[PDB]
Amino acid sequence: MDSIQAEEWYFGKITRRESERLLLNAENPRGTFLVRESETVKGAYALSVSDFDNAKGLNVKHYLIRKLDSGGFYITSRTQFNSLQQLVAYYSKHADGLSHRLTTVSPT
Ligand SMILES: N[C@@H](Cc1ccc(OP(=O)(O)O)cc1)C(=O)O
């Protein structure tokens, strides 16, 4: 499997604030996204996704991706993935509990 660093949507140690600055671009389709390290939960990841909310308008959603020491990743413990690549593919197809499905890799 490709290392996560080879994936166009993986931005590593980009901060939550830096991810919001990027994803709040009004040109980005709803569901523009990247994956990053979590700043608050060591060893976890975050899925950061451009959104349009009925009340808040343009906003960025952040979903915490937990990593099992035994192997695998999840946002909801009932729905586990063997890789971040599998997780991104799954949430690209359907929201299944996110605000919106993933549509667009954050441009850079
Ligand atoms: N519901 C939380 C879930 C969350 C928690 C932490 C997290 O990592 P970081 O602090 O790097 O954004 C990402 C998502 C949120 O909207 O922030």
From Swiss-Prot:
<comment type="subunit">
    <text>Part of a complex comprised of PTPRA, BCAR1, BCAR3 (via SH2 domain) and SRC; the formation of the complex is dependent on integrin mediated-tyrosine phosphorylation of PTPRA. Interacts with DDEF1/ASAP1; via the SH3 domain. Interacts with CCPG1. Identified in a complex containing FGFR4, NCAM1, CDH2, PLCG1, FRS2, SRC, SHC1, GAP43 and CTTN. Interacts with ERBB2, STAT1 and PNN. Interacts with DDR1, DDR2 and DAB2. Interacts with CDCP1, TGFB1I1 and TOM1L2. Interacts with the cytoplasmic domain of MUC1, phosphorylates it and increases binding of MUC1 with beta-catenin.</text>
</comment>
<comment type="subunit">
    <text>(Microbial infection) Interacts with HEV ORF3 protein; via the SH3 domain.</text>
</comment>
<feature type="domain" description="SH2">
    <location>
        <begin position="9"/>
        <end position="106"/>
    </location>
</feature>
<comment type="similarity">
    <text>Belongs to the protein kinase superfamily. Tyr protein kinase family. SRC subfamily.</text>
</comment>
<protein>
    <recommendedName>
        <fullName>Proto-oncogene tyrosine-protein kinase Src</fullName>
    </recommendedName>
</protein>
<comment type="function">
    <text>Non-receptor protein tyrosine kinase which is activated following engagement of many different classes of cellular receptors including immune response receptors, integrins and other adhesion receptors, receptor protein tyrosine kinases, G protein-coupled receptors as well as cytokine receptors. Participates in signaling pathways that control a diverse spectrum of biological activities including gene transcription, immune response, cell adhesion, cell cycle progression, apoptosis, migration, and transformation.</text>
</comment>
<feature type="modified residue" description="Phosphotyrosine">
    <location>
        <position position="45"/>
    </location>
</feature>
